[PDB]
Design a protein around this nucleic acid. Structure first.
Lengths: 49, 64
RNA sequence: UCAUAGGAUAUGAGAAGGCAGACCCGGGGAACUGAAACAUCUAAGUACCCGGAGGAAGAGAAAGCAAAUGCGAUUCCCUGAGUAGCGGCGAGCGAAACGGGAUCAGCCCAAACCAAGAGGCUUGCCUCUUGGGGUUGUAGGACACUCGAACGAGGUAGAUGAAGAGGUCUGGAAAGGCCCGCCAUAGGAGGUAACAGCCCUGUAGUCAAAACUUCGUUCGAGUGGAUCCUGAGUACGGCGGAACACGUGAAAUUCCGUCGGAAUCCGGGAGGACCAUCUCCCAAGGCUAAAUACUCCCUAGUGACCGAUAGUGAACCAGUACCGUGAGGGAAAGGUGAAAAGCACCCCGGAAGGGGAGUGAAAGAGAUCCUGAAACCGUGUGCCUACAAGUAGUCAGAGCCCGUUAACGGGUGAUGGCGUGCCUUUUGUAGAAUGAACCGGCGAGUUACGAUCUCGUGCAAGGUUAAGCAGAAGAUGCGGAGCCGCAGCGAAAGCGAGUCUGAAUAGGGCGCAUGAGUACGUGGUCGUAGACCCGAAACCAGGUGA
RNA sequence: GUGGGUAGGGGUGAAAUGCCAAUCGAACCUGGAGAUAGCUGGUUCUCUCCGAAAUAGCUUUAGGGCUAGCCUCAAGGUAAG
RNA sequence: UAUCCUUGGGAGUCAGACUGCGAGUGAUAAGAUCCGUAGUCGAAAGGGAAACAGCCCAGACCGCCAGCUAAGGUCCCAAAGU
RNA sequence: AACAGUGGUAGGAGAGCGUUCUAAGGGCUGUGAAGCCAGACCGGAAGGACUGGUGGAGCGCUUAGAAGUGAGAAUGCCGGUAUGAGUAGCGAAAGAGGGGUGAGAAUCCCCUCCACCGAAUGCCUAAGGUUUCCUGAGGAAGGCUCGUCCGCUCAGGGUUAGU
RNA sequence: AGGCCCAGGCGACUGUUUAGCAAAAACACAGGUCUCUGCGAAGCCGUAAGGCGAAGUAUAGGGGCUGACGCCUGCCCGGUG
RNA sequence: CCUAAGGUAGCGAAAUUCCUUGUCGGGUAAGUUCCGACCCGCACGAAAGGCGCAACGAUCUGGGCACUGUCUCAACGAGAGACUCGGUGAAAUUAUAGUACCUGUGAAGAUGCAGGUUACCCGCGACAGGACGGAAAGACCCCGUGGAGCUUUACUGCAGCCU
RNA sequence: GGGAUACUACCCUGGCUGUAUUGACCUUCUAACCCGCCGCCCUUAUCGGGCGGGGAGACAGUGUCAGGUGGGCAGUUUGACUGGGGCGGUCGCCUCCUAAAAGGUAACGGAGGCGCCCAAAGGUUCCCUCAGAAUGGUUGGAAAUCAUUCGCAGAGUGUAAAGGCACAAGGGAGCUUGACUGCGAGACCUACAAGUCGAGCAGGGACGAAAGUCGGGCUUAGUGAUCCGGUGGUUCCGCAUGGA
């Protein structure tokens, strides 16, 4: 509330939509990959453990 | 009773990195013939909320 | 006076009415309040009224969830998530599936056709009762081929149950102090003239039932697919409403009232308007326990719960006295002593009440009777006071009196200086502004769930469990579903230490590059809850009164 | 006089807002209900460090409220003042 | 001389008054109202102006039967110069 | 050691004091705890000791924990007691006297006059009251005084219907 | 167990009302007027069954207004109904 | 010029008249009242009825006779309170009080402040000038983004009725 | 005369008859529905209900929907400032003074204006110069239109005041649409919301030979949030998939 002066949020406009479809991918950088040994196979199931 | 997010604000704001909130500009809905092109171009861009208003609405956007 | 209401008789552990101020279904259904007004909305399908059973009820075996080398009845707990959404796009409201748990039961019909008996005949079109006939979606079935005892455990009454009047001291009284013993599957609890494992009742273990009463053991198929069936005034639509988190909106889905109104497996319904392909499924018929909710009750127990202005209104003859016509409102009041041993007897007195005597550890303990504060009321007294006006004190101070937690002491103070109480609210109060008659008790910023920040911890590019299952209502173990970070930008597709804008390899915005967060605890503050405590006039629902 | 009827988004009224159990411009009792109160009052132990404002803007706003100014505590820039 | 700025946690304040000085309104009236500027009070006791918040001097951490002063004052009340 | 500072409302920050219970360690207590009462003691404060009297069974200290944790005001609630104050009031009214009883008599009983009502202050009887009616005892409370008295207390007794 | 007389407003009169400030010029009144209603009248209570109206029938009922009696009650239908 | 029509009869400083105690006459020594009359009716008027009206009125207004303590202007007397004694015995209020008068100051009106002036201690009977006396959190006024009742061509709805 | 349409079978240049369907006026009845009409029975019953008769009658009543009317009834609103309220006046923006030689600074203080206008009154290149006065000149004067002289600004600048403008920002002509798109280093102003200026870069232009100017008026007013909805473009999403 702002004492009847209309609050900032209501003064400001609305922005765009959001949708159900959305592929958020678990990010992993190369710096993390160094922790594995030489010559290994790295796959998501292994990354989980 | 866990806190309720203020949906009327959540539909307007967005929390950028470093914890600041991004906003659009007002006065951009339905009068444009009474505004020179310069300010129209300027208001087209997005801005960020002020320090005092940020301090005031800290609570209302607790859960992003 | 065909025949029906109607009437008469008999037979029915048949209904009613109550209840636990709880829980579950429904039918009906507010305003206060929030929105800082107010009508959509909220409060809230809450309060309240009504009907209905249960010990639990509702729900239920897919016309489902979901889009994958798929799951397989419902119910409830964490999580999803304050997300997707809804909303005078305000105030606010607000899910579900996937995932992890407790629990685990699937079944029975109508229809087809067979059999009969069921008569009306207009020879099966309908009977009605059985059975075969059957309960099904990458369909199934008709139809032809295929086989009311004795026993264990409790519950209600109970039984048995170890070890010291140990000595000594004080004391009215040992359970207490000192010095010594013993039992302990028992050191639970209470009482015992003070604080007891060994004094008593009992406690740990071990037993017990004539009679009722609650729990566990005996007394069908597969192959074929001509024909037939697979829930009609039903689904669904228009109109107007309601529930779905969803306010008519893109408005799917469910139900209600009016009207209209399908198809039958080459068939139908759903996958959030709607169409097509695909995927899943078979409504318009029923039953179904456990997980779950709640205590008027009973049994055994627990409390960093109260201790007589508390704690139930009610420790005590309390929903009583009392008030009200009535609905209804609604108090106060615990404590002699260990044992009454509760005061023989005498004196004043009419008694009451006293003084003695006696009991007892205490009579100052005597019927509010353990302790007995203050206000208040009195009696003696050391100092002062009748020529002085005083927020009454303080600082000086003679005189008089007393002699201490011994110290540059105590009481009183003739006389001088200074000086308008406390609290709130105010620019401002001695204020002729407000509140207190005085004393005592009671009497106001907490708790839960989230958020954020500081501080402290264990780990750290990782941190961390929730529900739940074991576990003395505990810790601890398991439980990786889930949540926050390590990457950001954009509305989004999407790209990525870059990304957005833009024709731009230009400029500019955003964290770059200048790497700690997480779990928990205290503390500050915030948000939802009555939220810091007292106070409205008034509104709405149900009743009581002429 | 006795026995009865009319019950509160009502009843009665030769009409005053009269009466309806000493209450009536809408009776009484319980519940929603600890209604709400931007209003009035009050809010309890002590010492120490620092220590304001009564202003601007906007407000169905004027004795209220939000932001800014002014206060305080902590971590930093450090020498800007 | 050492107070300044950034971030973060927690506030109260939105009724101000008077006295100089420069103005408005008022009748250059008001202990009037509204501004700017400085001070005190607000939130500040002490000494002075008899008594007094805002006028003057001047800031209380406590004790002392010490001294020097500021405004004001020295005939008595009443300290100090008839 | 030096130097500087130490008025303060709304406010912010830090230090503490006390209270009730809970754990661990210690021990105080009928050779008298708690509580209360009185002292001329100690600390910067909230406060804490010590010595007596009362009282007659429980209770401090130490470290930490959790709070129904601290009252002087709310025309606060409850209980008790003041003030006004020995003041107002003692509720329309004719009694007077002699005996009686009695601890006590204006007030109770008896007697003699006097006085008041008399379409009532008389005589019956409703609603209603529910033992208050009668006899014998008592006088703490009720009785606006007293009271030997009664519509009060105690023990008994009392209401007879075919009309 | 009457004071009386003269005049004047208001109200014809008897009556009724603000229990508990106001008893009046306010209310009522008989009278007058307008209008509704053909009887399962209209109007009214109730949702509806049921009623009152009324075991009544436009010389009767409901509603509005004015208020004995005497003389009278003029103009405007533009507006609202 | 305008209206749809422009107030006729009756009455008129009236329950209606601010100017206003209208102007004139009566009544009285004197009349803002009263009665009668005039009309310049701010702002009478015909069913919100107009104008009179015998009778009536705890109605309102003016005048007159009788009457008197209403008065000049008070006096006395009777009874109940008050007053003294005896018995019994409250209440509103109350920050503590050893509670003077002037002038002045002050939140502008002092008992408590300043400077003076007066005042031995304590009671009994009366007065109400003050203690802005007590009773009542002002019924007046103002403000709550308070409440309630009522009204309408305020808004939005609803019952009823009509189609 | 244009195709004079003379032996498919034209649509009717739009006409009607005989045939199944729809609305109103008509009258009927069984036949619904109604009957606070009558006779009998249930039945010692003025309730209702069975029959019969009679009257009405597809109307009415009732159910759903729709429109009108509707203070009879219900929930609400009816602003603030204010030298107390009410009434009066005002409410946003722009210019000046009050304003105390930076900025800022109130009053129901003192004076005015705005809710537009301009396809040229913009941009650019190029060229000048005013108002008033005196004197001659007719229709024609006090001023029409001419010629000389004087003339620092008195005149103009779209409009209201101030600032500033004759090296034009005033006046005239030609061309033109920068009255552009993407932006924007910095800075002013600021509680927030917003408001203002801005060099410089890229793409394309306009003007001019070039330099170089142009991102609207000579500077300051001429204008409003969000929500919702309408319209155009979309290399965005669009609930199993493709579309919507």
């Amino acid at each position: 509330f702002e004492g009847g002066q209309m609050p900032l949020f209501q003064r400001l406009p609305k922005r765009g939509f959001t949708n159900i479809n959305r592929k958020e991918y678990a990010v992993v950088n190369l710096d993390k990959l160094n922790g594995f040994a030489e010559g290994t196979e790295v796959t998501p199931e292994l990354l989980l453990e | 009773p866990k806190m309720k997010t203020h949906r009327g604000s959540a539909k307007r704001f967005k929390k950028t990195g470093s914890g600041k909130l991004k906003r659009s500009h007002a006065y951009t809905s339905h009068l444009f013939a009474n505004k020179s092109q310069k300010q129209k171009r300027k208001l087209r861009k997005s801005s960020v909320v002020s320090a005092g208003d940020f301090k005031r609405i800290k609570q209302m956007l607790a859960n992003i």
